Amino acid sequence: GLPWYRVHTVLINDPGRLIAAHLMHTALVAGWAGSMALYELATFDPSDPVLNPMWR
Amino acid sequence: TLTYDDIVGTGLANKCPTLDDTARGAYPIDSSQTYRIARLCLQPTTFLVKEEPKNKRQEAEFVPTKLVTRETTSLDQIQGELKVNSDGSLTFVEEDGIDFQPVTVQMAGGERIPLLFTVKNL
Ligand code: CLA
Ligand code: CLA
Ligand code: CLA
Ligand code: CLA
Ligand SMILES: CC1=C(/C=C/C(C)=C/C=C/C(C)=C/C=C/C=C(C)/C=C/C=C(C)/C=C/C2=C(C)CCCC2(C)C)C(C)(C)CCC1
Ligand SMILES: CC1=C(/C=C/C(C)=C/C=C/C(C)=C/C=C/C=C(C)/C=C/C=C(C)/C=C/C2=C(C)CCCC2(C)C)C(C)(C)CCC1
């Protein structure tokens, strides 16, 4: 069958499933952005923009 | 004249009485007469909390807060002697009343600041 490094080639001639895979990728990335923001808000100390700003 | 049923659940019970704009008169003090405050009412409208200094040791400011304990903040039905002093100054000596309220206010970012808002032994 297909080697492991070729599994996604099933999408080349399947525009609908390619759109699905792209939707899933987009869902993952947007889910990352959301999760990352939440984790940052759960750890961020807003009490000192002078000596403890976000980049520290 | 408003009754309990007129007031209940409106928020008015936590408000102090007001006087209209025409009340700009003068109340004479006879220094031979004894006086009392029969009712002192205090209705807080803003609670400010002094931010803890970052370490810069400049002037830490008093910042706004959000009340979270609802319309439960006013001091009222307070009474006491109003003494006339020899130099003609008046001294209020708080005796009794609903002279405290626990209050919780919340700073930006969530820190909750409980206080005993009070004039006990004023
Ligand atoms: C954007 C991500 C993405 C998307 C949209 C797809 C989509 C697709 N894959 Mg591919 N795949 C991916 C990533 C992805 N894959 C990764 C990272 C691997 C290595 C594990 C694979 C390996 C793979 C194989 C072997 C096969 C596919 C196949 C397919 C198709 C059918 C679905 C399937 O069987 O998935 C299977 C893939 C998975 C179930 C992904 C693994 C899940 C990982 C472990 C993360 C799970 C999240 C987890 C909850 C978080 C863990 C947190 C941790 C800190 C503990 C479809 C085109 C099939 C295909 O059609 O072959 C012709 C197929 O046989 N994929
Ligand atoms: C938009 C970017 C993009 C897209 C959509 C594709 C899509 C494709 N690639 Mg190409 N490729 C890319 C960029 C991309 N590639 C980059 C940047 C490189 C260099 C790193 C390559 C090098 C490359 C090679 C050498 C090959 C492909 C192949 C393929 C095809 C099969 C993929 C597969 O089934 O893997 C299945 C993959 C797995 C089952 C697991 C992979 C696990 C990886 C290595 C580690 C974990 C990755 C992690 C989950 C991703 C994090 C996201 C990242 C951006 C930070 C498919 C058409 C194959 C092909 O042409 O088939 C005919 C093939 O041989 N790609
Ligand atoms: C009306 C014309 C039109 C419009 C507005 C779009 C718009 C888009 N296309 Mg293209 N496309 C078109 C014509 C169009 N296309 C035609 C005629 C073809 C040949 C069939 C294609 C083939 C094509 C492929 C193969 C792919 C796209 C993809 C995309 C999306 C990429 C960006 C993205 O996902 O953002 C992020 C998304 C958002 C911020 C949300 C947007 C909200 C959507 C539009 C509302 C959904 C409801 C709507 C009624 C149903 C779908 C609308 C559809 C016209 C796109 C974007 C929504 C890619 C995709 O879907 O990636 C996931 C993709 O893989 N298109
Ligand atoms: C411009 C931005 C961008 C681009 C071009 C891509 C492109 C890609 N992404 Mg997405 N991704 C992005 C942003 C992006 N990503 C962001 C911001 C997030 C949230 C963190 C993700 C989360 C994400 C997940 C969870 C997955 C992808 C996957 C993919 C691949 C799908 C096509 C494929 O089959 O490749 C085949 C794979 C390759 C060609 C190998 C790519 C190798 C990368 C570039 C470096 C790998 C590093 C190292 C070897 C392994 C990681 C270290 C390990 C300790 C974790 C493709 C390379 C999917 C994929 O890799 O499926 C197999 C996948 O599962 N991405
Ligand atoms: C369904 C639904 C829902 C929900 C959702 C959700 C809840 C979500 C999510 C999500 C999510 C929550 C997500 C996420 C994600 C993530 C990710 C995607 C990640 C990733 C990662 C990575 C990729 C990594 C990597 C790496 C490492 C690990 C280390 C170092 C290096 C690197 C960086 C490479 C709602 C209700 C709205 C509605 C409708 C339905
Ligand atoms: C219709 C319907 C339904 C639905 C559902 C759904 C649609 C679901 C889903 C779902 C989902 C879709 C889910 C998910 C998920 C996810 C995940 C599992 C994730 C994760 C993640 C992570 C792990 C992350 C991490 C991180 C990051 C990335 C960054 C920052 C940091 C941290 C670490 C936090 C039901 C059945 C109920 C029934 C009825 C109806």
List Cβ neighbours of A26 (8 Å cut-off, separation of 6 or more).
none
Q: What letter represents residue B21's amino acid?
A: D
The answer to whether the CB of A39 is under 6 A from ligand 6 is yes
* Four-residue CA torsion sign, B46, B66, B69, B104: negative
Nearest-angstrom CA–CA distance, B121 and B33: 23
Please state the atom number of ligand 1 nearest to the C-alpha of residue A20. Answer: 5
Q: Is B62 exposed, middle or buried (0-12, 13-18, 19+ CB in 10 A)?
A: exposed
Method used to determine the 3D structure: X-ray
Distances (CA, A) of B87 to A18, B90, B93, B115: 93, 9, 17, 36
Are B69 and B91 in contact, with CB atoms under 8 Å apart? no
Enumerate the H helices of chain A as residue ranges.
15-43
Indicate the resolution in Å. Answer: 5.5
Q: Residue B22 gets which letter from DSSP?
A: T
User: Cβ A50–B54 below 8 Å, yes or no?
Assistant: yes
